[PDB]
Enzyme design. Structure first.
Site, PDB file in Angstrom:
ATOM      1  N   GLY B  12       0.871  -1.058  -0.024  1.00 31.15           N
ATOM      2  CA  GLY B  12      -0.004  -0.004   0.092  1.00 31.15           C
ATOM      3  C   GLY B  12       0.811   1.187   0.218  1.00 31.15           C
ATOM      4  O   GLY B  12       2.220   1.220  -0.165  1.00 31.15           O
ATOM      5  N   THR B  15       0.869   9.319   1.424  1.00 34.88           N
ATOM      6  CA  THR B  15       1.138  10.623   1.024  1.00 34.88           C
ATOM      7  C   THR B  15       2.861  10.723   1.102  1.00 34.88           C
ATOM      8  O   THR B  15       3.299  11.297  -0.067  1.00 34.88           O
ATOM      9  CB  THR B  15       0.557  11.751   1.591  1.00 34.88           C
ATOM     10  OG1 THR B  15      -1.073  11.788   1.044  1.00 34.88           O
ATOM     11  CG2 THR B  15       0.835  13.178   0.780  1.00 34.88           C
ATOM     12  N   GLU B  82       2.599  -4.042  13.530  1.00 33.47           N
ATOM     13  CA  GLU B  82       1.998  -5.275  13.551  1.00 33.47           C
ATOM     14  C   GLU B  82       1.345  -5.554  12.128  1.00 33.47           C
ATOM     15  O   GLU B  82       0.829  -4.578  11.448  1.00 33.47           O
ATOM     16  CB  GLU B  82       1.022  -5.477  14.798  1.00 33.47           C
ATOM     17  CG  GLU B  82      -0.185  -6.407  14.743  1.00 33.47           C
ATOM     18  CD  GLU B  82      -1.166  -6.123  15.494  1.00 33.47           C
ATOM     19  OE1 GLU B  82      -1.811  -7.170  15.825  1.00 33.47           O
ATOM     20  OE2 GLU B  82      -1.208  -4.990  16.184  1.00 33.47           O
ATOM     21  N   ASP B 128     -10.574   9.397  10.749  1.00 31.82           N
ATOM     22  CA  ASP B 128     -10.759   8.913   9.263  1.00 31.82           C
ATOM     23  C   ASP B 128     -11.079   7.298   9.406  1.00 31.82           C
ATOM     24  O   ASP B 128     -10.557   6.597   8.751  1.00 31.82           O
ATOM     25  CB  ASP B 128      -9.348   8.954   8.542  1.00 31.82           C
ATOM     26  CG  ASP B 128      -9.558   9.203   7.218  1.00 31.82           C
ATOM     27  OD1 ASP B 128     -10.537   9.556   6.661  1.00 31.82           O
ATOM     28  OD2 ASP B 128      -8.610   8.743   6.334  1.00 31.82           O
TER      29      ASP B 128
END
Ligand SMILES: CN[C@@H]1C[C@H]2O[C@@](C)([C@@H]1OC)n1c3ccccc3c3c4c(c5c6ccccc6n2c5c31)C(=O)N[C@@H]4O
Lengths: 258, 297
Positions: B12, B15, B82, B128
Site C-alpha cells: 500500500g 502521501t 504489527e 478517518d
C-alpha cells in the site's frame, strides 16, 4: 469528552509523572542557568504572540525543552536552537496551521540555518523518543474550569496567566507537576477575582486540598506579587491584551488568608 | 537498523509513506513497514508522522494496530507495525455475493467500539474511520489503522482542523462547520461503517459536502431545533435546506433486527451530545450474544 472526562483526567495524571523533567537538571548544566532558561521561554512567549500560536503549543515546547535539557548538556550559544526546534515540534503537534520552517529560521535573526533547525528537530525527537503528547498546566486548567459555578472569563484568563508565569522560573516550578500548578493557579485566580476558594468538587476530582496545594500556592502567590519586577515581562505584556481580558492589570491579593 | 528486516512485497501507499509487508529475519515475525520520506531542505518531519507516532506509542490495545518500532536515519523514518492480512473493504468486496454473516458483523462492531473507546479515553480522535483503515487478521480480530489524521484533544475541545474525515463517513456537525467537534465524529463514522457492513454499500455516498448533507437529511430527516438544538445556528446551516421527513429506520438497513436498528440509530443521532459514546455502546443489547467468530480467509 464528558463520557471520558474522568478517564482522560486519570490518564493525564499518570502521564504527567512520566513526562516530568528532572528537578535538579540546571545544577548539572555546566554552561546554562535558570536565568538563561527564563530568557529563552520569554522569547518563546513573544514568538507565540508574533505567530498567534495556541497557549498549548507554548506549554508543550517548554515541556520538550525541560525534558531535552534533563538529559542533554547544552552550550549557551545553542540554547535558542533547542528552543526553536521544540517550538517547531510543538506547533506541528498542536497547531492547525503551523508556521513554516523558514518562519522559525527567520525569528532566530540569522543566528542559525534551516539545516540546523531541522537537525535539531530530529535530535529532539530522538531524545524524547517521540513522546510529544505531554500533559501541561493548560490541559489541567481547562478541565478545572468546568467546575466554576458561574463561569467567569476573568478567572479563566487569570488562571492561564499565572500558569504561564510559572513556565519562566525553573527554580521552584520544576518541582511541581502540571496538575498541582494548575490547582494553585485556579485557586489563586478564583480568589483574586471573586474571593472564592478551590471548590469542593475539585477535591473530589483531583484529591488535592488547599492544604496539599499550599506549597505551590505559596510560591505562585509570591511570583504573582513580584511579577511587575521580574526581568522578563513578555507574559505580562501578553496578558494586557483584550483577548485575555487584560488580567495582568488586575491587582494581586496581599494575603491568601490560609 | 533495517538489516534485520527483509521486504516481501509492496502492500500500500500514503502521501509520504510506502507500506511493505516485511519479515524479521531473527524473530521470524511478519510486520508492516511504513517508509516515510524525509526532506532536510523543506519542512522536516511531516506533522502527520509526528502525530501518528507520538499518539500511536500511547495506544496499546488489542484492537488498535500496534506500532512495534520506529527506525531512524537522517534520510528516512521507518515505522514497524504489527501485520494484518487484509482491510475491511477488500473483505466486503470478496463477500459481495453472500454477504457478511451477522455474528461476524456483531463481533467486528464490538471490537471496533473497544478500540475506539480506548482512543477516546486516552484523548485521541482518529478522524478517518472508513473500512479501508480497518484491518482484519485470520483470527477474527479487527483493528484500527492509519492514525495519520488523528489528534490529541483537550477536554472542552477547542476548534481543530475542519478539513476532516473522508466525505462518506463525515459527520453532519463537520459538514455544517460547527466551531467544535469531538469524539462523536468517530462514532458517526462507525455508524456508517456498521450500516455498510450490513448491505455492503456505503450509507451516504456523497460527491460534495452539500450532496453528502442532503443524502443524510433524506435518510434521517432534516434536523430542526427539536431534534438538534443549535442546528439552525451552525455556520453552514441555511434556512433554504429542503425539509425531508425522517424515514422508517427499518427501511434504512432492511436486514437489521430491532437491537441493531436501536444501536445504529444511537450512532447516527444528529446531536453530537446525544449520539452514543463508544463506551456506552459496548453495553448495548445488540451485543448480548457476541462471540469472536473467526471468518474464512
Ligand atoms: C487499505 N488502505 C491501505 C492498505 C495497505 O496500506 C495502508 C496505506 C492502508 O491500510 C490502512 N497501510 C497503512 C497506512 C498507514 C499506517 C499503517 C498502515 C498499514 C498497516 C498494514 C497494512 C496492510 C496489510 C495487508 C494488506 C494491505 C495493507 N495496507 C496496510 C497499511 C498492516 O498490516 N499493519 C499496518 O498498521
Amino acid at each position: 469528552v464528558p463520557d471520558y472526562h474522568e478517564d482522560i483526567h486519570t490518564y493525564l495524571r499518570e502521564m504527567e509523572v512520566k513526562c516530568k523533567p528532572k528537578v535538579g537538571y540546571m545544577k548539572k548544566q555546566p554552561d546554562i542557568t535558570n536565568s538563561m532558561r527564563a530568557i529563552l521561554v520569554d522569547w518563546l512567549v513573544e514568538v507565540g504572540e508574533e505567530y498567534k500560536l495556541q497557549n498549548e503549543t507554548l506549554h508543550l515546547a517548554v515541556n520538550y525543552i525541560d525534558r531535552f535539557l534533563s538529559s542533554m548538556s547544552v552550550l549557551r550559544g545553542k540554547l535558542q536552537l533547542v528552543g526553536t526546534a521544540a517550538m517547531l515540534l510543538a506547533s506541528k503537534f498542536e497547531e492547525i496551521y503551523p508556521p513554516e520552517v523558514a518562519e522559525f529560521v527567520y525569528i532566530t535573526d540569522d543566528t542559525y540555518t534551516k539545516k540546523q533547525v531541522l537537525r535539531m528537530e530530529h535530535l529532539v525527537l530522538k531524545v524524547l523518543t517521540f513522546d510529544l503528547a505531554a500533559p501541561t498546566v493548560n490541559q489541567f486548567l481547562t478541565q478545572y474550569f468546568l467546575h466554576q459555578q458561574p463561569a467567569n472569563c476573568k478567572v479563566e484568563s487569570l488562571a492561564m496567566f499565572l500558569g504561564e508565569l510559572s513556565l519562566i522560573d525553573a527554580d521552584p516550578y520544576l518541582k511541581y507537576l502540571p496538575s498541582v500548578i494548575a490547582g494553585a493557579a485556579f485557586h489563586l485566580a478564583l480568589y483574586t477575582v471573586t474571593g472564592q476558594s478551590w471548590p469542593e468538587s475539585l477535591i473530589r476530582k483531583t484529591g488535592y486540598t488547599l492544604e496539599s496545594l499550599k506549597p505551590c500556592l505559596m510560591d505562585l502567590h509570591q511570583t504573582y506579587l513580584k511579577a511587575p519586577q521580574h526581568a522578563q515581562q513578555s507574559i505580562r505584556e501578553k496578558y494586557k491584551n483584550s483577548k485575555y481580558h487584560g488580567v495582568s492589570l488586575l491587582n494581586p491579593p496581599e494575603t491568601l488568608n490560609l | 537498523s533495517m538489516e534485520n528486516f527483509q521486504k516481501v512485497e509492496k502492500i500500500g501507499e500514503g502521501t509520504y509513506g510506502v507500506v511493505y509487508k516485511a519479515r524479521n529475519k531473527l524473530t521470524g515475525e511478519v510486520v508492516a513497514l511504513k517508509k516515510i520520506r524525509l526532506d532536510t531542505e523543506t519542512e522536516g518531519v511531516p506533522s502527520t508522522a509526528i502525530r501518528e507516532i507520538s499518539l500511536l506509542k500511547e495506544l496499546n490495545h488489542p484492537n488498535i494496530v500496534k506500532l512495534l518500532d520506529v527506525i531512524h536515519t537522517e534520510n528516512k523514518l521507518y515505522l514497524v507495525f504489527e501485520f494484518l492480512h487484509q482491510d475491511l473493504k477488500k473483505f466486503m468486496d470478496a463477500s459481495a455475493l453472500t454477504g457478511i454473516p451477522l455474528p461476524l458483523i456483531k463481533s467486528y462492531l464490538f471490537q471496533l467500539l473497544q478500540g475506539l473507546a480506548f482512543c477516546h479515553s486516552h484523548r485521541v480522535l482518529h478522524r478517518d474511520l472508513k473500512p479501508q483503515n480497518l484491518l482484519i487478521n485470520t483470527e477474527g480480530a479487527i483493528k484500527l489503522a492509519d492514525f495519520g489524521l488523528a489528534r490529541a484533544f483537550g477536554v472542552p475541545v477547542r476548534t481543530y482542523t475542519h478539513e476532516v474525515v473522508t466525505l462518506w463517513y463525515r459527520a453532519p456537525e463537520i459538514l455544517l462547520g460547527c466551531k467544535y467537534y469531538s469524539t462523536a465524529v468517530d462514532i458517526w463514522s462507525l455508524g456508517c461503517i456498521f450500516a455498510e457492513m450490513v448491505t455492503r454499500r456505503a450509507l451516504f455516498p456523497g460527491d460534495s459536502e452539500i450532496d453528502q448533507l442532503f443524502r443524510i437529511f433524506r435518510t434521517l430527516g432534516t434536523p430542526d431545533e427539536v431534534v438538534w438544538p443549535g442546528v439552525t445556528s451552525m455556520p453552514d446551516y441555511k434556512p433554504s435546506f429542503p425539509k425531508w421527513a425522517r424515514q422508517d429506520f427499518s427501511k434504512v438497513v432492511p436486514p437489521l433486527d430491532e437491537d441493531g436498528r436501536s444501536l445504529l440509530s444511537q450512532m447516527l443521532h444528529y446531536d453530537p451530545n446525544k449520539r452514543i459514546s463508544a463506551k456506552a455502546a459496548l453495553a448495548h443489547p445488540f451485543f448480548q450474544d457476541v462471540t469472536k467468530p473467526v471468518p474464512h480467509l
